[PDB]
DNA sequence: GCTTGCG
């Protein structure tokens, strides 16, 4: 019930426009068979770097204790993040360590955009996959699902930006190439 | 303001 500003959303999750900020919307569903259904769904951004900072993914790992997940149970955690996790600042590694430590959890990452500023972004994406995280590019369905679930839309159905699907394809192309090796 | 924080 803590919802995101529509302009905030559209200007950060646009897969054709980079921003100097990162948003991470998350869900936690529990599975006691196949019945995940829907259940713990908030969102957050990074602590800006002011001379270091704390990347959005670490802040997620920060708040895991507060979710009070039952370690006997198995959960799917879903992220929709405006930038692909980095490697260099230790995010991919920290997440791997978290998945090893918390084997009850099944992680699913959709990214709006690929953070290729990090020269080691490919290593980050492959390492996450190897750790058993599903690593994916947001398509229209996932942009819509965050709009529907996280955004203070006030009954307005999502209006996709020009070139959403061209960019979504382009990036899905690059990402699959990367996970092939 | 222009935006993969900076000036
Ligand atoms: Zn990071």
Residue numbers in the entry: 10 to 48, 51 to 62, 67 to 196
From the paper:
The APOBEC3 family of enzymes (A3A-A3H) forms part of the innate immune response against viruses and transposons. The normally antiviral enzyme APOBEC3A is an endogenous mutagen in human cancer. Its single-stranded DNA C-to-U editing activity results in multiple mutagenic outcomes including signature single-base substitution mutations (isolated and clustered), DNA breakage, and larger-scale chromosomal aberrations. Here, we use X-ray crystallography to determine high-resolution structures of wildtype A3A/hairpin-inhibited complexes and demonstrate the underlying mechanism of inhibition.
Here we reveal the structural basis of competitive inhibition of wildtype APOBEC3A by hairpin DNA bearing 2′-deoxy-5-fluorozebularine in place of the cytidine in the TC substrate motif that is part of a 3-nucleotide loop. The hydroxyl group at C4 is coordinated to the Zn2+ center and is derived from the water/hydroxide ion bound to the Zn2+ in the substrate-free state. Tetrahedral coordination at the Zn2+ is completed by His70, Cys101, and Cys106. The catalytic glutamic acid residue, Glu72, which functions as a general acid/base, hydrogen bonds to C4-OH and N3-H of hydrated FdZ. The 5-fluoro group of FdZ is accommodated comfortably, abutting Tyr130. These results with wildtype A3A, together with prior work indicating hydration of dZ and its derivatives in structures with CDA and A3G, combine to demonstrate a universal mechanism of target nucleobase engagement, deamination, and inhibition.
